[PDB]
Design a protein around this nucleic acid. Sequence first.
RNA 1: AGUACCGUGAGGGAAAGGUGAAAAGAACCCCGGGAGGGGAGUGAAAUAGAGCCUGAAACCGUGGGCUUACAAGCAGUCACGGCCCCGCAAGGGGUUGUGGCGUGCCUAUUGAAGCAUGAGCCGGCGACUCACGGUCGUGGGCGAGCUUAAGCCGUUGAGG
RNA 2: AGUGAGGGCGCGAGCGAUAACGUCCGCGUCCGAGCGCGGGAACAACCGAGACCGCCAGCUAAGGCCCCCAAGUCUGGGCUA
RNA 3: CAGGCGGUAGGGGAGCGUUCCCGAUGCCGAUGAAGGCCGACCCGCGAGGCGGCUGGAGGUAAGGGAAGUGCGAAUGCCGG
Lengths: 49, 101, 139, 110, 156, 57, 117
Amino acid sequence: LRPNPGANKRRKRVGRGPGSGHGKTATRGHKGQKSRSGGLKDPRRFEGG
Amino acid sequence: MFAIVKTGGKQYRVEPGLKLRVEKLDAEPGATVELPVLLLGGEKTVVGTPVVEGASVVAEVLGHGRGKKILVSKFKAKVQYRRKKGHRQPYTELLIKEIRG
Amino acid sequence: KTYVPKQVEPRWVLIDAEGKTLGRLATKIATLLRGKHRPDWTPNVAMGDFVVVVNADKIRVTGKKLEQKIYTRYSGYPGGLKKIPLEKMLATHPERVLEHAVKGMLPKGPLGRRLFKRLKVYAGPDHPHQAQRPEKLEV
Amino acid sequence: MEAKAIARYVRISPRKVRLVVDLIRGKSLEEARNILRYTNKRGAYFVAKVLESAAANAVNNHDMLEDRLYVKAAYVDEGPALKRVLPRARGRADIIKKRTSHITVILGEK
Amino acid sequence: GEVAYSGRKIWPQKHTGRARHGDIGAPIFVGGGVVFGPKPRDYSYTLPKKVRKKGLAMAVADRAREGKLLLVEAFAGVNGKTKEFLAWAKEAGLDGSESVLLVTGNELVRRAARNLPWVVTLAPEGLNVYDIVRTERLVMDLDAWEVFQNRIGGEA
Amino acid sequence: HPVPKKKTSKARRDARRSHHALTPPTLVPCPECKAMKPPHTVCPECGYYAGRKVLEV
Amino acid sequence: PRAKTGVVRRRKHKKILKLAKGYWGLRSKSFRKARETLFAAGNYAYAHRKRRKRDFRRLWIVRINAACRQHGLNYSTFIHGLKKAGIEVDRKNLADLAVREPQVFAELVERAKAAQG
RNA sequence: AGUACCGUGAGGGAAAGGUGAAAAGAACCCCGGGAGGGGAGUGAAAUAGAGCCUGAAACCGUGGGCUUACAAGCAGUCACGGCCCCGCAAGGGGUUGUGGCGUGCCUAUUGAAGCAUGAGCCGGCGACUCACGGUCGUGGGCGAGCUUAAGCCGUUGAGG
RNA sequence: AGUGAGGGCGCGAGCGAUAACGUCCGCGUCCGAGCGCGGGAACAACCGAGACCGCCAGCUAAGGCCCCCAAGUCUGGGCUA
RNA sequence: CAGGCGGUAGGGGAGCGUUCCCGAUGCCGAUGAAGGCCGACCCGCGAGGCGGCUGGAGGUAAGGGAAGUGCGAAUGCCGG
């Protein structure tokens, strides 16, 4: 009934939404919802081959 | 009576009243403590004369206590430009009860 | 510090006008109708002096004469903005030419307003001032 | 309180009914009566009757110098409405809700 | 909850009923489906037996050093009925202001060791750091077994 | 086609409904019996000035 | 699971109900635009306590000019006066005194004219 | 409630949970065609009264306070003066006439007062997660460190 | 992790008609993204100036002082009218 | 003493209520759970106590854990 996680352990960054006051999370439209975009690497793949 | 010495910016022109003014929290570390303000603007009921000498002669003093504090009022920082955040008016002084002279 | 405005403190005054000159006399008459000069002088009034001036006419011209046209464009639009020259200006409405100076600087709708109220003159010769029976302060 | 003149679910109407009481209050049964009765338009009896019970509650279990009962403080309230729907070209739903009226008017003694 | 009863479409997502939306009984509204769904689930947690027992141990250790009742012996209850068991308690000095974890195969021990207060009924070589430090004091019988088990924990 | 813009508050609504307002009904007493009679008229009682010819049955 | 934030917002909002004093009909109970109108009022009092300084600045400015000149010479003059002026030169009262102790001003003056020379 | 109701059929596919502790839920008298309205009794309450618990916002209403017909302003709001209010005073309330200074917020903009837009008003719903792979951190166990599938004990089901 | 397009002003070349609140590049400032205060009437970028919060305090920029509105209808010497 | 503290995108830190899980139910409570209605002591705030009225029974945390959560705002969704 006392031993709270010592140092930091407990949730460190499950930061919700975008900013206390404001909010939005990132850039411009290019990364909307169904927006898991140009994934791992475009020109990097060029290299790959 | 209504005399003028003033402090921290001219907090004066008065007689024996709890005319609370500025926070000179030094002798405040003790309730009704006493202290002097170097005159400048020497003038009392008929005898009126000089603030030079006010800068250099008699001083007045009070017996004071209390404080005052945060005096409510808030201020919100926003700009049409797209934003807003705000807080409360924190201000005070242990206040003075006037000691003639 | 504080220092609140007294109470119904009334003062009027007689101004020559005549001989004196246009604008400048205005600047004067002008600020004269203070609200700031006698104690508790400010927003809600103060002096301004219920001031009245005569010989309003016979004023000296800023050396211009003709080339200074007041206007009155009540105009049902596409009407006339009625251009008028100082000459006749006064010829019929001198007290007014000065007037335009006066308002000229008098500000604030309701207030200034009230002041013109306490601002009266007559290019009449003086007798008018007489009609204003009351006290007769002067300069 | 005093002579209560009020009632529920009768589909008459706001504003208008308010007009009636507007004019009839002030005075007493005598005068406001004559007006409520011989002045034209709906409400007439609705109003009058409400008056009636008011007065009965009055000299009955409030009683007071009956003759001087005069409408004191009063006016109206409207509860729900019947939600009716009509036709208005290229079908479309044209809606309406008639006012089921309740009156809040009190007879006071003086 | 759409798939099947997904309401295909109903708003002429055309361009006049002013309104957007093609699918009825759609997420974003009226009692329909909700965002990041309350998916049935479970919290597995293979927490390394290493320190797991290491601790069960540590907890046992402190809890006990403050108040430790390694019984090995006890007897007061018709083989262990309530009333008599109770007497025992008064004997073992166990009263109100006390909660102890009764732990071990002395099944008459569990048998009488019910009662919401004072005692908690644990007749198994079933232990756990929690119940451990949470139960005022440890009280247990077949402690030959226990202490030795804990040791097994000690060196595998 | 020309649906206003908003409603200058109950404020306005009133401005109007207001100049509107409901006046009251003209009346003096029966030239014959009592009660209220509007100028030229008779009624379910007196009903006349020269021959009731009206009321009661 | 659950999360009827209701409790909460009904609250946050009435809070707002008060936030809103009882402004001009509609921007009064105006929830939304109420709040807005408020942000306004906020930045406003802002500006307010901010510059009330200059406000006084002037206030006295004139009250006093009023007196100094009424007497003998405007600001360049009078001011410069308290200026040349030695272990005595104060302001947040020049007015005050000009007012309260007619003598007070008459002479602060006297000396001052001299103060300049 | 898969019934209302739309569709030709295929097919779509609501809403409405609570009076009270128990019915004692309203004899009876009074305006009235009636509803419904004042009384008596109910009772611990009936502002617990039949859609009748808790029963707020919105909007309309009855009374009271201040306020208003030479006025040009989102808003406001700093100041002050006149009212009225709790007040022991200190003074604290609400109300404003005089004046100073003040382009409303959201989105997408080099760029907004917008005449670009979103915005009818209230209320409840309303959107960066979960499973793993990983990956970097860093809080914790030993350096070789950790354990799936299972067999077993398992109110607590106890962990091994 | 975010912009991956932006505009304005000054100087330096394009271009354009040596036109445009044109568009091309560069040095700088800029303005957004702080650039919310002064300000020049009022005016995103022109001179002043960086606002963590107070003051019924005082010294100053730019740029101002007959008045409307704080500040000499300063003085001195001219020249237009 | 520095010394700085306009500042969206965006990155870091630090707190806030919010309904549940232990809550090692402590209980609190018909001299009210709760939501509500109003208020010139607490908070740098998100919030807090506390006082007064309603209101019919809950509610809950000392410390820590779990998240359908905090919303003008989307010609939004449903009802006025």
